[PDB]
Symmetry: D2
Subunit: 284 residues, 4 copies
């Protein structure tokens, strides 16, 4: 992707037909370039209805997910491949251009001990098979590094790149998230530097998942480093005003992240757009 986008938890809990209507209508009011749609219940997504909305309103889209425990790639790789194939097909059917997020495991996945080579070997096989299926449907895959409490396998930019090189495909990119990097990166710019050759998507998410510009993320370091590495991918907001039920346990939003979507979008999006112009990011 390119330009500015929003994860649709800003506006709807589930990507059902009324939720798709609500999210797409809210998106055009902010003049964003794309939306990111959760692919958490693929058989439940009405792809024809979503595609019609996206094309009517000239909105691009990608999808993201976390794997359900029955299909965690680290331990149940055959089930993961089957699940990812379903999710890839539905993403392509609605006009999405990539499937990203925690496509290699669960949001809330934790064995209780550090990750093992056997787990990474399983993940690499899953992603290799999924990337071939994605290629057959004309979409790319994204691997999002998330913090230690949401997954034990891929937490940093450097680990995400290590997995992309372990898999050896040509259609998997790295997806970073400033909320996760705020915990995981030894200096937030290091995550961007480490991922630079594969970085195509970033969640500009505040440290408490609230309003960008009004938490602890080091935004000037983030934007300066994105400009320096020539970042030209998707800049996407992620604030859990609404919480998709299938990932609520893992995402740990126990209290409102902000007053409402009007506060987050009304203050956060102008802040991020202004920072992108300030540091001269490509496309700004």
């Amino acid at each position: 992707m390119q330009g500015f986008g929003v994860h649709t938890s800003m506006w709807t809990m589930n990507w059902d037909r009324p939720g798709a209507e609500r999210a797409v209508a809210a998106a055009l009011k902010y003049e964003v370039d794309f939306i990111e749609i959760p692919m958490l219940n693929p058989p439940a997504v009405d792809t024809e209805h979503t595609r019609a909305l996206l094309e009517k309103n000239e909105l691009r889209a990608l999808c993201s997910l976390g794997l359900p425990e029955r299909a965690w790639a680290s331990v149940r790789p055959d089930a993961a491949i089957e699940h990812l194939k379903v999710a890839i097909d539905k993403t392509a059917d609605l006009g999405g251009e990539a499937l990203s997020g925690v496509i290699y495991g669960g949001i809330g996945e934790r064995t209780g001990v550090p990750p093992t080579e056997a787990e990474y070997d399983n993940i690499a096989r899953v992603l290799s098979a999924a990337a071939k299926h994605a290629k057959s449907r004309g979409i790319e895959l994204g691997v999002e590094a998330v913090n230690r409490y949401e997954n034990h396998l891929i937490n940093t930019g450097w680990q995400a790149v290590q997995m992309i090189e372990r898999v050896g495909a040509d259609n998997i990119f790295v997806h970073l998230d400033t909320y996760h990097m705020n915990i995981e990166e030894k200096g937030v710019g290091n995550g961007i530097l480490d991922a630079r050759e594969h970085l195509k998507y970033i969640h500009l998410s505040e440290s408490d998942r609230g309003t960008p510009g009004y938490g602890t993320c080091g935004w000037d370091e983030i934007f300066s480093t994105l400009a320096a590495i020539g970042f030209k991918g998707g800049l996407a907001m992620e604030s859990f005003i609404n919480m998709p039920p299938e990932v609520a346990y893992g995402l740990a939003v126990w209290r409102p992240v902000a007053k409402d979507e009007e506060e987050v979008m009304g203050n956060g999006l102008p802040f991020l757009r202004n920072k992108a112009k300030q540091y001269g990011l490509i496309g700004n």
Copy 2:
């Protein structure tokens, strides 16, 4: 507690006799004013050996714990009270001045939904009983706010203050932790601002539990805000370097937090001391 201290996890998580000696030796090496003693198994602590060590070396101390699952206050308050009474007595008998930490629950609590009045009612009953026991032994209790993933009940300075007000004791204080605040506070200074009437203790920990000064924590805002509220409590350095593996895994340490002790202590403690001097906490 006043001045600079260290949480002894970098040398000792099991407070047995050689572990106590090892941690006191480190405290003298780094010229700190106090130590924080983790109590993984309060019944096993030799109170007289530790008391003698502290007095001989002019070191002050407090203790900290998190409740085990069999005694999580929100659901098993009678067992929480029993566990806390033992820890309070051991703390007092070794010469400690407070028991702090996750004394209201455990690492690993998560319901998937917001905390409830029923849960908070049980925590308040536990903390009231524990505060009474602590007062009878002449020590205080600290409530450490921890991030959303560790516990769903007390995550912010403002939530910690709400619980202290709900209990209505006068010997419970707020314990903040810059690693947790880096996630939970809407601007890191707001945790200190919200807790200012009750803040007596802060863990100075980097955002990745590594070396203070070399992460994402907003140290200038932290120290300026501490100075502005006139903070004179404990400045306690905390790093997860060299934690025993089983403890580290329980805290979601899946990879090294830093290179070694010389990196963490040789760079992190001077950074924190220098910042405290810069902003007049000294």
Copy 3:
């Protein structure tokens, strides 16, 4: 002075009748609580017209100036007192509540050596006389610390407080400016900390005099520290956008500080108001 205000330089440096109307119109457009009126030529100010504008539009005001070279307090104290008395009377008569700024000297003072006791004695004699005149008219005086290149005498919060103590008046306060503190203070919060007992006014200005929020000022540390000291004075936005060229050149503006008013006010004012809300100054 309380709440949010603007220095009117962005619309009016020459406070004549159309300029006063222009600035008050801008103040209502941006829904501020007060304006700061620069007084380049105090005798030319129509006090009755300005007073009626402020009362009709429910606007509060203060005034500011820097001393011209013919009246630099450090070297020409009697001329400085005559100049300040005229400015104080004009301020009081138009309804302003204080005269602040570089009232102790001028932009462009520099001896090449540290400030001397002789200079500070002259400044103190000037300020003492001016403060008594201000008290007789019911207004206060503000001393604005400015950076080393503008004036060699009062650069930090701690220097400003020392001058307030040297003068010994009770109606002189400290006026800080985030642009100057960005250069002068050893950690920006230290200027607020050092001035805390006397700080009643702060210029919120970006590091390049452009758009607040989009430079190098440490806004989170600034706002957290203001909240922590209980700041209840004036929060006054200052930008050099659209200043008259001759005034701008005297302030070392050699190139545009920002694109236009819409960039500065449309991005910078919401940023500052949002930060004030975030840290509970509101």
Copy 4:
């Protein structure tokens, strides 16, 4: 230059023979790679004495200056060329590898109005001639952007690059200074970004000229952006513990920048070395 260095105002007020002895001894105690020597009194410099000190102690060096008013390039270009030729020759004779700083004007230079094309024409002619003379002596020239109060002509990384492109000499590099960028750059990383193709030297100088790490400079943004652009030049401290008399009026140090040299070097150098390590700067 490469590695870590120190401007010798840390240790001596003038580069006389006793001052050279003291500064070189101090530089070895801190194990820095080079020193930066003010070339403010070229006829007074004992070049063989300094050259012998540097070679004996395996220390590299460069020189810096500001032009005296009698030879300000923007208004007296012929005098400026003659002065720079003298300074270039002394720099080369003592073993220095470059002459940097405000080689295009004065520290404290101010007309009262914005810079004009005629002034830039004069600087360009001066630098072109100085660049050829520097080439003949085998050294390079650096152009340091300084803040609006020290010079009205070159204040930003982008302005410095514009001059270097205008002159067209490949032996002139850009020299940035975090103390100056703290005022001049709209986000400090923008100075590094704008200068990335020509940046070979940076003063890591705190916002009040005191101890690095204990002022207002955005060090994490600075180091992350330097790493992102692949900076491989000199990282040099500048703290005016001692003040060269010829530039004191322009540098505006009216009160101690720090307690003493041991405080700045004892706390500031480890901080900067640690940050360079943290962000993986080339050569650290």
